[PDB]
Paper text:
There is one molecule in the asymmetric unit and the final structure contains residues 24–333. However, the functional role of this stable protrusion, which differs from that in the corresponding part of CtCelA, awaits further investigation. However, structural comparisons of the active sites of Cel10 and CtCelA reveal notable differences. Two of the five aromatic residues involved in stacking interactions that are critical for substrate recognition by CtCelA, corresponding to Trp205 and Tyr369 of CtCelA, are not conserved in Cel10. Phe163 of Cel10 seems to play an identical role to Trp205 of CtCelA, while a residue corresponding to Tyr369 of CtCelA is missing in the Cel10 structure, leading to a significant broadening of the cleft at the cellooligosaccharide reducing end. Consistent with the homology model of CMCax, Populus tremula × tremuloides KOR and the expected structure of AgCelC, the absence of subsite −3 of Cel10 is a common feature among cellulose biosynthesis-related endoglucanases. The absence of subsite −3 may account for the recognition of such lipid-linked oligosaccharides.
Residue numbers in the entry: 24 to 333
């Protein structure tokens, strides 16, 4: 549609990179995976193959089958950080699975299978009596704590994986991730922060190392919850918090430890997630010049989440 064409015109380079034009024009596996999902949804196989070809040739980590998470084209070494971002790897593998169905080509599913096997082998660990997906292979396993990002619990992707391969392991991860998320939540909003520290006895708190806000990571949680199951009881704190504000005066973040809220309000893609969470009817998205990469992406992912309720 028009939104997707405008998205490619503003953010997709001819080499297949998606450009975070608000963050120094960098590319990352979240951006590639988001765009690959949207390319399938718009039945745009040329764009999908360009996005995937650049991702695979440029970012593949050959030691474990995952992907270097960030590409900075102005840096002396554009792939300085050699760690992965597990939500990006997941989105890429999920887009490939959906590409097989859309275009009836098993090669996309064979590619997906390698990545999902890599995700289970290298990013999923046993901790506090549950299976948990780390945000990356390195840097998040502190000894008696894990630093987790619940916005990387991409429930609709995990369900798709389970239908294809390693059903029991992916189903257990989904069960454990819903259970952990159900135990999260702080302050008067009872919402999770972007980053959550899980201690080995099960105790959770907002992680020490980041601002303890529900903000640009955590807001994807109700998106993924509603994408997988709009009737989920895990949506309850999200609906309650958003219902306590006027639609056009909903704070863009909240500090869940102090209850301080942003002095500015959700618009664009953030507002689209709010509308999705509350079930408020919204029409197909339009990508305005006031949307950055992040807002433009969320607008279309919200629309896709609605479409997948068929």
């Amino acid at each position: 549609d028009t939104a997707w064409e405008r998205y490619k015109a503003r953010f997709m380079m001819p080499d297949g990179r998606i450009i975070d034009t608000a963050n120094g024009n960098v590319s990352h596996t979240e951006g590639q995976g988001f765009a690959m999902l949207l390319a399938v949804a718009n039945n745009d196989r040329p764009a999908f193959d360009k996005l995937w070809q650049w991702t695979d040739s440029t970012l593949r980590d050959k030691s474990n089958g995952l992907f270097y998470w960030r590409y900075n084209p102005v840096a002396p070494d554009p792939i300085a950080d050699k760690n992965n971002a597990s939500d990006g790897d997941t989105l890429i593998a999920w887009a490939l699975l959906r590409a097989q169905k859309q275009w009836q080509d098993k090669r996309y599913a064979i590619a997906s299978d390698a990545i999902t096997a890599s995700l289970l082998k290298y990013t999923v660990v046993t901790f506090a009596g549950r299976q948990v997906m780390l945000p990356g292979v390195k840097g998040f396993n502190l000894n008696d704590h894990l630093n987790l990002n619940p916005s990387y619990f991409i429930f609709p992707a995990w369900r798709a994986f389970a239908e294809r391969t390693h059903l029991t392991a992916w189903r257990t991860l989904q069960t454990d991730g819903q259970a952990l998320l159900g135990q999260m939540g702080w302050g008067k909003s009872h919402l999770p922060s972007d980053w959550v520290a899980l201690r080995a006895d099960g105790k959770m708190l907002p992680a020490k190392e980041w601002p303890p806000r529900m903000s640009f990571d955590a807001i994807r949680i109700p998106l993924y919850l509603s994408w997988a199951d709009p009737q989920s009881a895990l949506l309850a704190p999200w609906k309650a918090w958003m219902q306590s504000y006027p639609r056009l005066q909903t704070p863009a973040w909240i500090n869940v430890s102090t209850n301080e809220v942003a002095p500015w309000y959700m618009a664009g893609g953030l507002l689209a997630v709010r509308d999705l969470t509350l079930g408020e009817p919204q029409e197909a998205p339009q990508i305005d010049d006031k949307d950055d990469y992040y807002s433009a992406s969320l607008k279309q992912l919200v629309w896709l989440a609605k479409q997948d309720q068929r």
